[PDB]
């Protein structure tokens, strides 16, 4: 699957995203392909594999 | 009176990307950008690639 | 009343089992999983 | 055919033991077969009924 | 003594390890509460056997001590046997809804329908089975409802 | 499973070799954990996805 | 009397490896000369990593 530590730990672009439903509607909805949510801070991120 | 773009922009393949190709099957685009912006610290691009 | 103090120092280096031994010193291997250095040989 | 050619010479290194006033190249002929597929001629099998 | 670690015969593939990466801090049981162990005792598939019972998994499960799976860089899973009242965090793959209030015991993995069973680790005769976290009154429903089968 | 397109692409460095046995009885005999023995010639190092 | 080293091989890692490693978990000792050596043409290297 798609490794979101690439997300994390590269650096990204700020912007301003201005979409117009809640973004937890927007996923629970499924509207996004594959998400990927926690709910803490999970150190998954740290695993450099 | 309008402004519209002459041709379309040119997304040439860096040859740093070029190990990556053959390699790993991915791109990653201006990598160049993601190398000095990630060892220089600064975690935020000026603009995307 | 004593306690031990007639041991020695030994290094890696310096016994001679470093002759099978390339030794390399690289800081990140807690983070590294597998080191694969894989061969092409074509044949005669 | 002895006038055919001969012209110069190399110099090159080999290993020659003394038998009576006649010198002999000694020669392993290992690296001409060293992972090929034909077998090495002087090998062979010899049968005693 | 705090901290078990293990090891395959296999070594780790970063699909492999990427799968197992998901899983810290989830509940892993051990037969045995010894420092070095094998991955061929661990977790559960080692006692789990067909047409023998679940109510024998039932009581076997229910005998093993129970560790958490953490800090895993290559050969090295370290489950962890957690103290006796310290707060943990675990992680549950068994599709029950939970509720603040109610307590936790560990039941054997049950079919639950879709004909899925993930075992989210295969290997060449062992895959991974893990122990259900379900909160209580299921629970006790099980157990009352097998007693009564 | 593996990127063998990578190994042969890839730029290499030169060794002399000396095998236990031979190659081919190292090839079908499972000495090493991935080989890749195709005879004649295989054109699927190209298509680079 | 033999002559050996006195200190350990150091070995260094290049950022371009750093981001490699960041995405996709892989690491290609000395990139620079494999990108080089790539994009100019010769395909063996001096030594390896």
């Known amino acids: ?49 | 009176t309008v402004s519209a773009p002459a041709t379309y922009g040119n997304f040439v393949l860096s040859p740093e990307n070029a190990v990556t190709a053959i390699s790993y099957h991915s791109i990653l685009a201006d990598f160049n950008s993601y190398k000095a912006h990630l060892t220089s610290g600064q975690p935020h691009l000026p603009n995307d690639s | 009343g004593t306690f031990c103090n007639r041991l020695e120092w030994v290094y890696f280096l310096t016994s001679g089992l470093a002759a099978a031994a390339h030794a390399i010193k690289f800081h990140d291997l807690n983070k590294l999983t597998t080191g694969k250095m894989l061969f092409h040989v074509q044949v005669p | 055919l002895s006038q055919a050619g001969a012209h110069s010479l190399t110099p090159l290194s080999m290993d020659v033991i003394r038998l009576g006033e006649k010198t002999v190249i000694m020669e392993n002929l290992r690296r001409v077969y060293k992972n090929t597929d034909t077998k090495d001629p002087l090998e062979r099998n010899v049968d005693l009924t | 003594e705090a901290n078990i670690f293990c090891t395959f015969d296999h070594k780790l593939s970063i699909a492999d390890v990427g799968k197992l990466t998901k899983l810290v801090a989830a509940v892993v049981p051990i037969p045995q509460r010894l420092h070095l162990i094998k991955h061929y005792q661990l977790g559960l598939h080692q006692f789990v056997d067909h047409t023998r019972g679940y109510v024998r998994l039932r009581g076997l499960l229910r005998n093993m001590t129970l560790t958490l799976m953490r800090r895993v860089e290559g050969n090295q899973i370290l489950l962890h046997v957690p103290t006796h009242g310290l707060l943990y965090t675990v992680l549950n793959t068994g599709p029950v809804t939970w509720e603040k209030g109610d307590a936790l015991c560990v039941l054997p993995p049950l079919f639950h329908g879709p004909l899925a069973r993930e075992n989210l680790l295969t290997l060449g005769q062992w895959e991974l089975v893990l122990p259900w976290i379900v909160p209580m009154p299921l629970a006790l429903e099980i157990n009352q409802r097998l007693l009564i089968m």
């Open chain 1, 1 to 49: 699957m798609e490794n979101w530590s690439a997300l994390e730990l590269l650096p990204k672009v700020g912007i301003p995203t201005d979409f117009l439903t809640h973004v937890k509607t927007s996923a629970g909805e499924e509207m996004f392909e594959a998400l990927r949510i926690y709910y803490g801070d999970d150190p998954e991120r740290y695993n450099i594999h």
